[PDB]
Amino acid sequence: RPKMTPEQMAKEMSEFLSRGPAVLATKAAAGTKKYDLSKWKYAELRDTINTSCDIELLAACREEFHRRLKVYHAWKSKNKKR
């Protein structure tokens, strides 16, 4: 496993999001978010994205990364403050 620290994993997620931004402003978002990736490990998602051959799947992973990153920031906020 990558055995990367929480901050390290977050940094990688941001880099992937920046590399391939996904606005999802189009209807393409619908039918894609239904995919369950929150249960996929960080390493699994990384491999999935690299091996991803579908744009829909790529967007799904990007969405999971954004949501995961958001939660991470919120968690840190609680420990850092309040």
């Binding site: 929480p6 994993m9 977050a10 997620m13 990736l37 929150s38 249960k39 996929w40 490990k41 960080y42 999971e64 949501r67 995961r68 990153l69 939660v71 991470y72 919120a74 968690w75 840190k76 609680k78 420990n79």
Partner: peptide, 16 residues
């Protein structure tokens, strides 16, 4: 404890 929670957030997709 806390570290484990962060790991889950960026691994298991847990809320923390």
């Amino acid at each position: 404890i806390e570290n484990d929670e962060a790991f889950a957030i960026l691994d298991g997709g847990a809320p923390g």
